[PDB]
Amino acid sequence: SGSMKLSVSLSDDDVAILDAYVKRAGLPSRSAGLQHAIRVLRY
Amino acid sequence: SGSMKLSVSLSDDDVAILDAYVKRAGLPSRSAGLQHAIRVLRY
């Protein structure tokens, strides 16, 4: 039960993909996108 | 080189996992880690 407000630098290209993925999958925010992203990087 | 800066609230476990991947791949920053993740989502 912890949260870190963080800053990340993504390419103009990266964020455009992230935004597209987030809105496409119907994610509440970029955070939720990162949840999926972290999951695939962990395993 | 000239990218965007996103402020995201990420969970404690998630950032810890990201940091694990970042050091694993010898990445320069957390950004490079998420760029890989964003890219693996789109391929």
Of the candidates B8, B1, B21, which has an alpha carbon nearest to the alpha carbon of residue A34?
Answer: B8
Look at strands A3-10 and B4-11 and give their pairing: antiparallel
For chain B, helix (H) and strand (E) counts, in that order, are: 2, 1
CA atoms within 13 A on the CB side of A9: 5
Q: What share of chain A is helix, strand, coil (3-state, %, to 5)?
A: 65, 20, 20
Residues of chain B contacting residue A10, judged by C-beta atoms under 8 Å apart? 3-4, 6, 31, 34-35, 38
A11 and B37 Cβ atoms separated by less than 8 Å:
no
Q: Rounded to an integer, what distance in angstroms lies between the CA atom of residue B14 and that of residue B33?
A: 12
Question: In this complex, do A4 and B10 lie within 8 Å of one another by their Cβ atoms?
Answer: yes
Question: In this complex, do B21 and A41 lie within 8 Å of one another by their Cβ atoms?
Answer: yes
Of the candidates A28, A21, A25, A33, which has an alpha carbon nearest to the alpha carbon of residue B14?
Answer: A33
Enter the tokens of residue B26. Answer: 């010898």
Q: Rounded to an integer, what distance in angstroms lies between the CA atom of residue B36 and that of residue A33?
A: 13
> Residue B39: CB partners within 8 Å, gap ≥ 6?
A14, A17
Question: In this complex, do B10 and A9 lie within 8 Å of one another by their Cβ atoms?
Answer: no
Please name the residue of chain B whose CA is at the shortest distance from the CA of residue A18: B38
Solving technique for this entry?
NMR
